[PDB]
Write a protein that binds this DNA or RNA. Structure first.
Lengths: 149, 75, 87, 77, 70, 111, 82, 87, 92, 73
RNA sequence: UGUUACAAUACCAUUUUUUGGCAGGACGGGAAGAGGAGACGUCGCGACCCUCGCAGGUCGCUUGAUGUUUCUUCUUCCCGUUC
C-alpha cells in the first residue's frame, strides 16, 4: 500500500511517472517533490483518490484505467485543468453527483470506456454541475449546448 | 572597456530617449567609453505637441547614465 | 579591515536579513560572497506589517511568511542583517 | 567629431551660459555658467539659477558644485 | 551557486516578476541564462513563456531553487 | 499519529529509515533511527544524532562490534574529549602508526 | 570572459527580444552585441508597456537599461554545454 | 513496416487549437502508458502527427485499441510510424 | 606603503565622525533612505560606510488614516549596508 | 577653471549648503573635510526641510550617494 | 604526474554589487430587479471560412481571458466554507 520509497524514484519534463505500480490507497503523497504539473496515476489499482490537500500545482491528474469507482467533491487540487477518469469501474451517476464542488478551473474531463458513459441523457447530466469545462470525452462543447445547464 | 561602436551613427539624426520619460532628437557629434553622447542640432521633444529646438548648432552633450536608448532616424 | 570578510565569519549563524523592498529574511547563512551575496537555508521570509510591490515576490516563492529550503540573495539588495545576540 | 570631454571644455573657454538638466527630477532645471568640471562630470557652475519647469521663475544660487551623477543633459543659450 | 548549476531557479527580479528556468550558467555580475524560462508578474496566474533568455544581475533581488534536474 | 503510517512503511533501502528519522530530526527521530539500526554510514548518522558522554561511548562500542581506520579517528576524538579507549580501538581493529605515535606524544607531553 | 556575454556575442545574426527597465519590449534582429551588454538591433518591432506597438529600423539600447534579452533556442546546444 | 516506439497519428480534426490538440492527445494516450514526446506540425504536416511512447509494448496496445475512435468529430487512425522518431 | 595613505586620509577626512563615535563610544544617529532613523553606537567602520552597530534603537514612521504613530524597536546587534546611509550625525 | 577637488577643499571652513537627492532635506553648515570621493563632513549643521529649517543638529556626515549639489552661502 | 572541488594570496566614480530612493450569523460565486464605463494593445471558445497534407491567418463571443490609462451601491433567490 503505496510505500514512500516508491513515490520518488520518475520525473521528467513534458510530471511524475507513477504509472504501472499497482497500489491501493494514497497515504504518503507528503513526499511529492513540489514542482509537479502532472500526477500520472494510471494503470494503478486505485479504488479512490483521497489524500490530496491543498496541492495547488498539478495541471493534469491522470487517473485513467484505474479500477476506480468514485470521484469526490471536496478532493482539492486547485488547478486541475486536465483530468482523466476513463476506463474505470464507475457505473452510476450518483457516484459522480459530487462533481459539483470540483474547482472552477476544470476543463478536460474524460470518462470514455466506462460503465457510466453508455447511459442515455449523458452529456446533459455531466455538463450539469460541471457547467464550464471545455472538452468532454474528447468532444468540444459549445455554449448553445451549455443552455442545457 | 570596449568602444561602443556608434561610428555608423556619426553625423546622423538620432533619437535619444531619456530617464524621466524625456525624448531628445539630435545629430551625433561624439561619444566615449561611458556612452556620453554629443548631439548637434538638439531638438527637445516635450510632452503634448511642441518640439523644442534646443541647441541648433551649439553641440549639446548628454551624460551616459541618463541615456535609455537611441533610434537612428536614417539608416 | 574589509567588513565583507567580517560576514565570512558568520557561517552557520542564525541571522535576520532585511532587504530593500521591505522583505524580512530570517534564517542561517551557509556562506557569503565577496560581493556580499548571501546564500541561506532553513529560512522563512515575512513582509512585516504594511500589506499595502515586493509582496508579489514573496508569493513568487513557495511562500505573508513563506519558507524556502535554499535561498540566494544578491548582496546589493541587503539593507541590514541582524546577527545573533550571543555574538 | 568631438569626444565629449573635449565638448565640455568649450563651454569653459568660451564661458557660455549653460542650462543643465537633473536626473529623474523633471520639475526643476538649473541654469548657470560652467566654471569647472572633472573627469567624472562633477560640475562646478557659476550664477546658478533654478528653473521650475511647471512662467519659469528662478532662485539665484550662484556658486554650485553639482555632482555629476545627477547630471543628464548639457546645453547652453 | 556553481553547485546550483542546471537546476530550475525560481529567481525574483526587481519589479516583482518571478522567473522560473533551468540555470545554464552564471558569472561574476550574477548575469543568469535560463533554459525554457517562464515569466510571471502578479504572483497559477499571469505567466509568459520566454525560452532561452538572459537575466542581468542588476535586476535580481533573490534566487531560490525550484526543482531537481531530470 | 504520523508514526503509525511510518511504522507500516518500515515493516511492510534506508528510505523508511530516512523518512522516519530525517523528517522528525528530535526524540522521535532518535527513537526511529536507533530502532532501525538495531533491527558504518548508519552508525555515523546515529552518532551525529546523539551529539550524553556515556551514550556516545556506547555508540562507539556498538560500532566497534562488527572503515575501521576511519572509526579509529572517531575513537581517538572520543578519548580526547582516553588511553584505554585507544587501546580498545587497537585491539578490535588492528595505517595506525601515525595515530599511535600521536597518542604516545600525549604520554610524552605528560612525562 | 563572462559566459552570458560570450553567449550574447554568439547571438549575432539572430532575432531576439529586449525588454527594457521601464517596461518596453524590443523584438529585433541582433547584429552587433557589445561586451558591456550593449546591443545594436536592426528591423526592430517595439512595444510600449501600455501596448503601443511600433516598428523601427535601428535601435541601440545601453546596457544598464536592459531587463533581459531572449536569444533563440539554437544556441543552447553548443559550445556552452561544457 | 516496423512496429516501434512512435505510434503514427493521422487524420485528426483540423479545426482544433494545436496546443489543445497536443494536450488532448496526451490525456487520451496516457491510459496506454506514459506519453513522452508528441511532435506535431501545422507547417503542412497538418492532419498528421507523431506520438512517441516509452515502452515498445505500450504502443502495441493503443493501436489495436484506438484505431477507429471519434475524437473531436472524426474517427482517427493510429499506425506504427515508418521510422523511429528522432529527438 | 599603500595603506597609510588610505588610512590617514581616512583619519582626518569625512570618515572622522564614524572614527570618533566608535573611539569615544558615543551614539550617532543615522537616517537611512527609507526614513529608518537609527540611533546606535558604532563597533566598526568600513570603506563603504558599512557599519556594525550595538544597542540599535531604530525609529521609523508608519502612516495611517489618522495621526501618525511612532514605531520603534531595539536591536541588540546590527550589521548595516552602507548603501542606505544618508546622514551620520553625532549627538554630544 | 576651479576643478571640484580644488574647488571644495578651498571651500572648507565656509558655511556651505548641501541639497540632498531627495529634496526633502538640506543641510547648512561649515564643511570640515572632503575626500576625493566627495563625502562631506559638516559642523553646526542646520537641517532645511523643503527649504524651511528643521533644527540645529551639530557635527554631521553626508554620504557621497546623496549629494545632489553643494552651494556656498 | 594529471583532473575536480573548497579556502588563502591579487580588487564607493555613469553599463551591473555599494540603491533615483521615498512619499441563526459571517465570507465567496452565479442569476434577477432598482438607483461600473470608454480607449490601446496582448493570448483564447465557435466558424458559414481559408487552406489539403509525414516531416495557425480572418470573422463572431450570442455576456472568452488579461496589463496601462481617465472618470464616478442596495434588495431577493440559489450553491459552497466557517462558528
Amino acid at each position: 500500500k503505496f510505500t514512500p520509497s516508491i513515490v520518488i524514484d520518475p520525473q521528467y519534463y513534458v510530471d511524475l511517472q507513477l504509472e504501472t505500480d499497482s497500489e491501493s490507497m494514497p497515504s504518503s503523497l507528503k513526499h511529492l517533490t513540489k514542482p509537479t504539473h502532472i500526477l500520472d496515476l494510471t494503470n494503478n489499482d486505485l479504488i479512490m483518490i483521497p489524500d490530496l490537500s491543498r496541492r495547488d500545482d498539478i495541471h493534469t491528474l491522470l487517473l485513467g484505467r484505474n479500477n476506480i469507482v468514485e470521484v469526490d467533491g471536496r478532493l482539492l487540487p486547485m488547478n486541475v485543468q486536465n483530468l482523466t477518469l476513463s476506463n474505470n469501474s464507475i457505473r452510476r451517476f450518483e457516484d459522480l453527483q459530487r462533481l459539483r464542488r470540483a474547482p472552477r478551473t476544470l476543463k478536460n474531463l474524460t470518462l470514455i470506456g466506462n460503465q457510466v458513459c453508455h447511459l442515455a441523457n449523458y452529456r446533459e447530466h455531466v455538463l450539469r454541475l460541471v457547467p464550464h469545462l471545455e472538452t468532454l470525452d474528447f468532444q468540444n462543447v459549445t455554449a448553445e449546448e451549455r443552455k442545457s445547464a | 572597456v570596449s568602444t561602443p561602436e556608434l561610428k555608423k551613427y556619426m553625423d546622423k539624426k538620432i533619437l535619444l530617449n531619456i530617464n524621466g520619460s524625456r525624448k531628445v532628437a539630435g545629430i551625433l557629434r561624439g561619444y566615449d567609453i561611458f556612452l556620453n553622447v554629443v548631439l548637434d542640432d538638439a531638438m527637445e521633444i516635450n510632452g503634448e505637441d511642441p518640439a523644442n529646438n534646443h541647441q541648433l548648432g551649439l553641440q549639446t552633450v548628454i551624460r551616459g547614465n541618463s541615456i535609455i536608448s537611441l533610434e537612428a532616424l536614417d539608416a | 579591515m574589509k567588513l565583507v570578510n567580517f560576514l565570512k565569519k558568520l557561517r552557520n549563524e542564525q541571522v535576520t536579513i532585511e532587504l530593500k523592498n521591505g522583505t524580512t529574511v530570517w534564517g542561517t547563512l551557509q556562506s557569503v560572497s565577496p560581493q556580499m551575496n548571501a546564500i541561506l537555508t532553513d529560512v522563512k521570509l515575512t513582509l512585516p506589517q504594511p500589506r499595502l510591490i515586493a509582496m508579489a515576490s514573496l508569493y513568487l516563492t513557495g511562500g505573508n511568511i513563506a519558507s524556502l529550503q535554499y535561498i540566494n540573495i544578491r548582496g546589493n539588495t541587503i539593507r541590514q542583517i541582524i546577527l545573533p545576540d550571543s555574538l | 567629431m568631438v569626444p565629449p570631454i573635449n565638448c565640455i571644455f568649450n563651454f569653459l573657454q568660451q564661458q557660455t551660459p549653460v542650462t543643465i538638466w537633473l536626473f529623474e527630477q523633471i520639475g526643476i532645471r538649473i541654469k548657470g555658467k560652467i566654471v569647472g568640471f572633472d573627469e567624472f562630470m562633477n560640475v562646478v557652475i557659476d550664477e546658478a539659477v533654478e528653473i521650475p519647469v511647471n512662467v519659469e521663475k528662478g532662485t539665484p544660487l550662484g556658486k554650485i558644485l553639482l555632482k555629476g551623477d545627477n547630471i543628464t543633459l548639457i546645453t547652453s543659450a | 551557486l556553481a553547485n546550483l548549476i542546471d537546476y530550475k531557479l525560481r529567481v525574483l527580479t526587481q519589479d516583482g516578476r518571478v522567473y522560473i528556468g533551468q540555470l545554464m550558467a552564471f558569472d561574476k555580475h550574477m548575469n543568469l541564462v535560463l533554459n525554457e524560462c517562464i515569466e510571471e508578474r502578479v504572483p497559477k496566474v499571469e505567466k509568459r513563456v520566454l525560452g532561452l533568455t538572459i537575466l542581468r544581475g542588476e535586476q535580481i533581488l533573490s534566487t531560490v531553487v525550484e526543482d531537481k534536474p531530470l | 499519529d504520523e508514526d503509525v503510517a511510518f511504522e507500516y512503511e518500515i515493516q511492510k533501502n534506508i528510505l523508511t529509515w530516512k523518512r522516519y528519522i530525517e523528517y522528525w530530526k528530535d526524540k522521535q527521530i532518535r527513537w526511529l533511527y536507533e530502532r532501525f539500526c538495531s533491527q558504518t554510514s548508519i552508525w555515523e548518522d546515529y552518532i551525529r544524532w546523539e551529539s550524553e558522554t556515556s551514550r556516545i561511548f556506547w555508540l562507539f562500542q556498538r560500532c566497534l562490534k562488527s572503515d575501521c581506520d576511519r572509526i579509529c579517528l572517531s575513537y581517538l576524538e572520543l578519548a580526547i574529549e582516553i588511553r584505554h579507549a585507544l587501546a580498545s580501538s587497537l585491539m578490535k581493529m588492528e595505517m595506525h602508526r601515525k595515530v599511535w605515535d600521536p597518542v604516545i606524544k600525549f604520554v610524552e607531553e605528560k612525562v | 570572459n563572462g559566459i552570458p556575454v560570450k553567449l550574447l556575442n554568439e547571438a549575432q545574426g539572430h532575432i531576439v527580444s529586449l525588454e527594457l527597465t521601464t517596461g518596453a519590449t524590443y523584438r529585433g534582429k541582433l547584429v552587433e552585441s557589445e561586451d558591456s551588454m550593449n546591443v545594436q538591433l536592426r528591423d526592430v518591432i517595439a512595444t510600449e508597456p501600455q501596448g503601443a506597438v511600433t516598428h523601427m529600423d535601428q535601435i541601440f539600447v545601453r546596457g544598464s537599461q536592459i531587463k533581459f534579452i531572449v536569444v533563440p533556442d539554437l544556441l543552447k546546444n553548443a559550445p556552452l554545454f561544457k | 513496416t516496423e512496429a516501434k516506439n512512435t505510434l503514427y497519428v493521422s487524420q485528426l480534426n483540423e479545426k482544433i487549437n494545436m496546443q489543445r490538440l497536443r494536450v488532448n492527445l496526451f490525456l487520451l494516450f496516457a491510459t496506454f502508458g506514459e506519453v513522452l514526446k508528441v511532435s506535431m506540425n501545422f507547417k503542412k504536416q497538418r492532419g498528421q502527427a507523431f506520438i512517441t511512447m516509452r515502452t515498445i509494448d505500450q504502443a502495441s496496445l493503443a493501436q489495436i485499441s484506438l484505431n477507429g475512435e471519434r475524437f473531436f468529430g472524426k474517427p482517427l487512425k493510429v499506425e506504427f510510424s515508418k521510422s523511429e522518431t528522432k529527438t | 606603503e599603500l595603506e597609510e595613505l588610505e588610512e590617514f586620509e581616512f583619519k582626518h577626512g569625512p570618515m572622522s565622525l564614524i572614527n570618533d563615535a566608535m573611539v569615544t563610544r558615543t551614539p550617532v544617529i543615522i537616517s537611512l533612505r527609507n526614513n529608518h532613523k537609527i540611533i546606535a553606537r558604532v563597533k566598526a567602520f568600513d570603506r563603504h560606510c558599512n557599519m556594525v552597530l550595538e544597542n540599535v534603537k531604530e525609529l521609523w514612521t508608519e502612516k495611517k488614516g489618522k495621526n501618525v504613530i511612532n514605531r520603534e524597536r531595539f536591536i541588540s546587534k546590527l550589521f548595516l549596508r552602507g548603501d542606505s546611509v544618508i546622514v551620520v550625525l553625532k549627538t554630544p | 577653471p576651479v576643478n571640484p577637488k580644488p574647488f571644495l577643499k578651498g571651500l572648507v571652513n565656509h558655511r556651505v549648503g548641501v541639497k540632498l537627492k531627495f529634496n526633502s532635506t538640506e543641510y547648512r553648515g561649515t564643511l570640515v573635510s572632503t575626500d576625493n570621493y566627495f563625502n562631506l563632513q559638516l559642523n553646526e549643521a542646520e537641517e532645511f526641510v523643503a527649504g524651511v529649517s528643521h533644527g540645529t543638529l551639530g557635527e554631521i556626515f553626508i554620504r557621497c550617494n546623496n549629494v545632489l549639489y553643494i552651494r556656498e552661502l
